[PDB]
Amino acid sequence: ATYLIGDVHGCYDELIALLHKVEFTPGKDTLWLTGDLVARGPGSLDVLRYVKSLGDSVRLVLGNHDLHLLAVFAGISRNKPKDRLTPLLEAPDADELLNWLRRQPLLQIDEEKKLVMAHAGITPQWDLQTAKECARDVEAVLSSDSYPFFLDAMYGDMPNNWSPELRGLGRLRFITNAFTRMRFCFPNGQLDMYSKESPEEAPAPLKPWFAIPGPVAEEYSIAFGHWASLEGKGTPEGIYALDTGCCWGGTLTCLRWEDKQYFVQPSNR
Ligand SMILES: [Mn+2]
Ligand SMILES: [Mn+2]
User: Which reaction does it catalyse?
Assistant: First the structure.
């Protein structure tokens, strides 16, 4: 079977309970994870150990909190106490875990399932070939010996409009923001980098990225996390918002792909 789970955010206990509920069996089942494995929740270290141990039975995409963790680890950014990353950072196996983490994709595609996954979604200004190439560019920098320089460069909210003639720092920043921070769009597809509230509360003319027709979303289903104020509701057919805010006292959501059946674990907080 195929299972998709939203942002775990260090909620190791809830993740294991949810997986036991569906009797996830490595080697017979595959787990897709929408990223943001770490931060807020108490057990980022345990989540990383477990997910890494799953090997080929897991398909991950990196989120904005995974990339922030890598930036803290590399000395690029300051550790925030509320993230509760210190046990993972100080762990004897931290180098191994994080060198594995930075090697993971930004985008997962399964042609047989007609399924695409990224942390925040697929921006409507991209087709599948462009999404693939941008994923590869950022993955190449993240998995290189020089990744701290990229991580330092990634911060910033501009440029917010895609053009194939984007080059250098601006190109990398747009790709990163589109894959891991995108929520709202302007009518032409421009990224808004400020509003984090629900669609109902969004000021005009902002619309969810998935409310704007795009080539990928017309040929593929898209699963994503990141957007917790969405609370997994209000998406069109073929769009699955799996982030239901476990770390925030909400729930961890699992979707079985074969029958589109949902399973939920309540937050312990
Ligand atoms: Mn996120
Ligand atoms: Mn999140």
Answer: P(1),P(4)-bis(5'-adenosyl) tetraphosphate + H2O = 2 ADP + 2 H(+)
